[PDB]
Amino acid sequence: GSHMSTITRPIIELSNTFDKIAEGNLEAEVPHQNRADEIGILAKSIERLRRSLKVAME
Amino acid sequence: GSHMSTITRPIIELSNTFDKIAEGNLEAEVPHQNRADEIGILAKSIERLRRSLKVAME
Asked: Where are the beta strands (DSSP E) in A1-58?
């Protein structure tokens, strides 16, 4: 592919985050958490799901 | 105006999906699964996580 645009950057990062969640890793950090636009909200949603997983394992 | 725009439609749908996942619901379906662009790939990632949750419960 091409890294000419920064739109691919957040999408690739979110993909890696989903993998770590599926594997049962509750230590990885979610990216773009400090964003304000719709991308920021989506990242926050992932973080919420991660927290719920930790509670279940506990 | 904003409602007419389809930019908010996919983000809102993804949010609802995250909620259903957090609640332990493995019956809800993921939207935009048939998409080809980066949005389609992201939806597929959510579906994979949902499947993993079902395996853990079972």
From this structure: none
